[PDB]
Amino acid sequence: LSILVRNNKGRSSTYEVRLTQTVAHLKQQVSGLEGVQDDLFWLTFEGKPLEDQLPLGEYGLKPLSTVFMNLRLRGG
Amino acid sequence: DEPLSILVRNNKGRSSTYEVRLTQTVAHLKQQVSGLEGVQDDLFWLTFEGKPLEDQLPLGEYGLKPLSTVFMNLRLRGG
Amino acid sequence: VLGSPAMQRIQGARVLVSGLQGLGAEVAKNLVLMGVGSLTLHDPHPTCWSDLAAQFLLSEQDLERSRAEASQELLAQLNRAVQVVVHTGDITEDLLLDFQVVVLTAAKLEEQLKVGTLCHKHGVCFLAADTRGLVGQLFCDFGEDFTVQDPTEAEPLTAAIQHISQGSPGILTLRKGANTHYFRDGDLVTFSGIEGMVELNDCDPRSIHVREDGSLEIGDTTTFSRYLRGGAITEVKRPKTVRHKSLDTALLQPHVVAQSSQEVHHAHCLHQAFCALHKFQHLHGRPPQPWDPVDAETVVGLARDLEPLKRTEEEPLEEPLDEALVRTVALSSAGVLSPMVAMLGAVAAQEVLKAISRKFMPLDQWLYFDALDCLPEDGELLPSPEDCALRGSRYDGQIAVFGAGFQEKLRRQHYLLVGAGAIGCELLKVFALVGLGAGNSGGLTVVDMDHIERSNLSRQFLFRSQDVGRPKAEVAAAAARGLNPDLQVIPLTYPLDPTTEHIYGDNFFSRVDGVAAALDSFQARRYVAARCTHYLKPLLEAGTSGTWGSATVFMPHVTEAYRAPASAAASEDAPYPVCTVRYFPSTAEHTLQWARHEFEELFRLSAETINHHQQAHTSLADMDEPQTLTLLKPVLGVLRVRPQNWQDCVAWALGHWKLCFHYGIKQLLRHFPPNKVLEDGTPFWSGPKQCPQPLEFDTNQDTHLLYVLAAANLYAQMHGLPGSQDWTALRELLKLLPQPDPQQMAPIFASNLELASASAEFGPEQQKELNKALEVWSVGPPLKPLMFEKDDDSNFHVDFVVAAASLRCQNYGIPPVNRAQSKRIVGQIIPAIATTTAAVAGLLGLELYKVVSGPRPRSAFRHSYLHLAENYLIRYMPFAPAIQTFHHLKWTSWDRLKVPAGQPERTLESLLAHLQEQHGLRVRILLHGSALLYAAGWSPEKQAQHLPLRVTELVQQLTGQAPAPGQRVLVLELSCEGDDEDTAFPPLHYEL
Amino acid sequence: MASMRVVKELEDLQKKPPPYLRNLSSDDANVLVWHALLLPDQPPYHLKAFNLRISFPPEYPFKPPMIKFTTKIYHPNVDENGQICLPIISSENWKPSTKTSQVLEALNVLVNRPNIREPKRMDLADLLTQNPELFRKNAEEFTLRFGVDRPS
Ligand SMILES: *OP(=O)(O)OC[C@H]1O[C@@H](n2cnc3c(N)ncnc32)[C@H](O)[C@@H]1O
């Protein structure tokens, strides 16, 4: 099934992401395709922050998840 | 055509004597108030005798007699 | 805000609340929430049915019981500090002597006069509030001498001192700002921060004289010492005194609070009507029957019989009594409403706190709130005695004013409460008591994406203390269902933002009959208003700040659409400039954000730099790894090995402070002299308003130590070693070590033989040292990043950032941070006051009555704005919708262009032709969101490549997305040939 | 919506492009992203061209556009990431009235006349004010190493 993936720059570019596959192996590919440092922004659905040690099944990633990232840091 | 001196009242218990004219506009009054109080025009409005003031009408329609207090009301965001 | 002087007096005060009907329950609830120490209730009358439509504490099972005793349990449960007791005797002099405030809510004139006389005799502040249908009444008498100590809802002023000279006037000049115009002659000022003029600090407050060109003076300063630089000048408030006439005297010559003269006349008519109602109650024993024509005539006859000389003789009334007003008030004076109760209870509790804390200007003995507009219009059918007759349901209080038909219309509704923080919770209480969606054909919905916090539950009644963590939506839904058992709340956790447009779209917004948005931001309010305009839904919006409040209704096509303050909406989420961060935080706010972002970049990124990035794929060969390691590692100690020493000491804190202020300022001075610019040579002004000095730490001063403590505690918490609060013993330890720096001056700067390090002279030795430190940290324990948490005081975030900001501002001569700037900061925000929250909730409830009533003219609706500190309340009918026009096309801010697609989906050419002919407009730009579809300056080849296609296919080709399954319309923004850069054409709804 | 204003601005500026800016383009997919080739006048930047990327947030014109030098450029107040500290772009001098044309003119002025008042690269600003000869050396090297060929 299709899950809405969006970028903070105004382009969605939905990608094939499934629950049967780990979220890390998909977010790494998305970050590589985009070209922006992952540490700049944390992917987050419905307002739940994602951690390096956080099971996704506890929070229950909904289909068509409202996943978006928030810009942080101060590069310049 | 004669000028008058109204007292615009700030939202923090302060007043200021602005020198305006009955042929001016509430937009001009808002600009002067904004300039003096360091506030944006779209962030505040101003009222007189309960009723608010549309920023497209001359101040003469609204009955601003000299020595009048035009209150300044801020748009509130807290919920 | 939370002022310790006033709060000390708040807890030590005792207030009696007699006549605990709905209004008394509202007043008592607000007092308990605000934190009144003791609360003696008094209402021995048995609970009736009509008390269940306005009072939330009493339930259906509390029938035939004393209202005070029944409400005592819930009122005590609301806040445990408040000691809510119940008095079962009678109001006697001995009882009245002990209390500090006495509030008679909905009590007869006899008891009002008796208790008022008794209280005014000795020392007791007295209030007498009463709601009779849709008209309220408040009287406040605070004795013959009541001294308020702070007559404004504003912090004392402060201004940066530029220079002061000596002489007979002692004229001093200050930096340009709004404070220059704010300051006025005859005021009172004090001084606390100044370099030079040593004993002028802590001196007596003194007057000033305002001269032209912003010139001020203090007096005689010639005898004093030399002045170097000026920190700040602070204004001082002048305590005011008020004398209030007693009740028996003021009842004859009322002094109403109003913002006009016609409103004063209206309030005089209302006062005559209330006196007539009291005289009727004394002459007949029973209140006027619900909407009884006979009783209304008797009441108006009594109003005429009331002495025309009872009015003041120095200003005759322009017209005799308003028979229509008195008759309407008598007719609707049967029941008691929930919104009106909330509004009057909010005002009465604010007055009680005014009396208790001797703060803010008190009410001038009379206030009358008129909300008769909620009644049906003249043409429509006014409710009859037959349907206003009580039946036995909980809503018979509302029925006796509005009618069973209106009650059923309220019952059969679907609404959407977006946001349930504080105004949302009180709007939920109002909805539950009113009966909005309590039937089987109706319902409710609560949307919230937050979780209850210990800070939020402080002044909120729906949320308890055992619910910290559970969703606000779910808790508020449970509370509302507990309040009204027949209600059907559907808590939704997903927020209302552009990302969540697939959940809350078409199918969702098709069932809702209205929207009530109690939000805490401007962008969210603008988005919700945009959705409500797109779906043509009524919207009720409230907003509070301190004692300010605003309540507005935006009914489609009758009232102006909600427009947000775009400036503030952008300011909500906007970065700050970096020039002030680097070299000139001209104000305490820039030095505050510098401290915040410096701490963020030094700690949050430290966690990722020690382990993740270094150990995953990169090394020091990245863009600049040595700089990132230098900004965190050496400043926190040489380390380079696993630290076996305790992570709670002062050895590295002082070195960090040296590098943060003294070394930084010295390095800046070496970069350029404070008085000259090397490139300019001979500039227009040599060193204009910039003279930074390096700071030396003093152990005695509190700011330096508090910064040290905060840094040490946070570093211990961050490294993971158990950190102990230094305020007991380790502060004394750092005081015991007064001179750790002289033995470690040179080596702590950089390595061992780098006094200044020149330019990139660290070399391979230092590079390898940094790499070894990175490897040691990678093999060591991982530091855990921490976020800004106001609730947890142990992290020492707010104190640390405030101390750093104060230190740097004093280094730069900037006046120190004040509490006002911290409050204005989005973080560390104070909760809204329960009084203003209840006021806006009640006003929104009245707007809900008007909305639910049905098709109503614009003049029926009212937007309200209040300020309780100044007792300034306005309720004004809103403007007509704006009418914008271009050529022959005319439109407003609500309407939309609706072009159909057709069974064969039309092409770009077809749509363009349809527009151009049907609405007579030549489109130049056709945008879908941020996707162009057809320009006019486009090359003919591009036009002939895009035009033959069809709109739905073109959107697909450009975006890369697919048409939504179940999509109904496509919104496209169109421009026109020869149009101004301001004209906003109505959105085009391509009906696919 | 800011998108219509940005489209109008780009269409207005395309018919009369400034001399220092060429191929001011944007994708129809996302019209809030302008791609441009800054062409300096004052050496050594006068040799090559630099591709920049202007991004307009949806709060425009109440939120300053973000300018990032996609091409690596040797400027005392331009970071290697391409960020720029233009005084008008900073959120203290921004007004909705100021246009992207004026912003780009100020950017050209900044590039042609290196700034030291607000150094984004304070280290390299110090090297500039000390040894401008070494600065021209590194400037020429970086221009000839990263700069895009100057179009006709
Ligand atoms: O009472 P309060 O001023 O704290 O109100 C804040 C509440 O509003 C909710 N909120 C804020 N913004 C939104 C959006 N966009 N959608 C849904 N709810 C929203 C907060 O969650 C809080 O409960």
Author numbering:
A (entry chain D): 82 to 157
B (entry chain B): 79 to 157
C (entry chain A): 21 to 1012
D (entry chain C): 2 to 153
Can you quote the paper on this entry?
ISG15 is a ubiquitin-like protein that is activated by an E1 enzyme (Uba7) and transferred to a cognate E2 enzyme (UBE2L6) to form a UBE2L6-ISG15 intermediate that functions with E3 ligases that catalyze conjugation of ISG15 to target proteins. E1 occupies the apex of the Ub/Ubl conjugation cascade where it performs two main functions: (1) specific activation of Ub/Ubl in a two-step process that results in the formation of a thioester bond between Ub/Ubl and an E1 catalytic cysteine (adenylation and thioester bond formation) and (2) recruitment of cognate E2 enzymes followed by transfer of Ub/Ubl to an E2 catalytic cysteine (thioester transfer). While Uba1 (E1) is specific to Ub activation, ISG15 is exclusively activated by Uba7 (E1) and specifically transferred to the E2 enzyme UBE2L6. Here, we present cryo-EM structures of human Uba7 in complex with UBE2L6, ISG15 adenylate, and ISG15 thioester intermediate in a conformational state that is poised for catalysis of Uba7-UBE2L6-ISG15 thioester transfer.
The double-loaded Uba7-UBE2L6-ISG15(t)/ISG15(a) complex was prepared and imaged by single-particle cryo-electron microscopy (cryo-EM). Two reconstructions of the Uba7-UBE2L6-ISG15(t)/ISG15(a) complex were subsequently isolated, which we refer to as Form 1 and Form 2, with overall nominal resolutions of 3.38 and 3.21 Å, respectively (masked at 0.143 FSC). Both reconstructions exhibit the same overall architecture and do not appear to be functionally different, with the main difference between them being the strength of ordering of the SCCH domain, ISG15(a) NTD, and ISG15(t) CTD. Hence, we constructed a composite map and the refined coordinates derived from this map were used for descriptions of the structure below. Globally, the Uba7-UBE2L6-ISG15(t)/ISG15(a) complex exhibits a conserved architecture in both forms of the complex with the AAD, IAD, and FCCH of Uba7 engaging ISG15(a) and UBE2L6 sandwiched between the UFD and SCCH of Uba7. Consistent with the Uba7-UBE2L6-ISG15(t)/ISG15(a) complex being poised for thioester transfer, the SCCH domain of Uba7 is observed in the open conformation and the UFD adopts the proximal conformation. Density corresponding to the pyrophosphate (PPi) leaving group and Mg2+ was absent indicating that we have captured the product complex of adenylation, after PPi/Mg2+ release. While the density is modest, likely due to conformational dynamism (local resolution of 5–7 Å), the ISG15(t) CTD clearly extends away from the surface of UBE2L6 and is wedged between the UFD and SCCH domain of Uba7 (top view). Interestingly, the active site of the Uba7-UBE2L6-ISG15(t)/ISG15(a) complex represents a hybrid of the adenylation-competent open and thiolation-competent closed structures. To our surprise, ISG15(t) is located at the back of the Uba7-UBE2L6-ISG15(t)/ISG15(a) complex where it sits atop the AAD and packs against the UFD and SCCH domains.
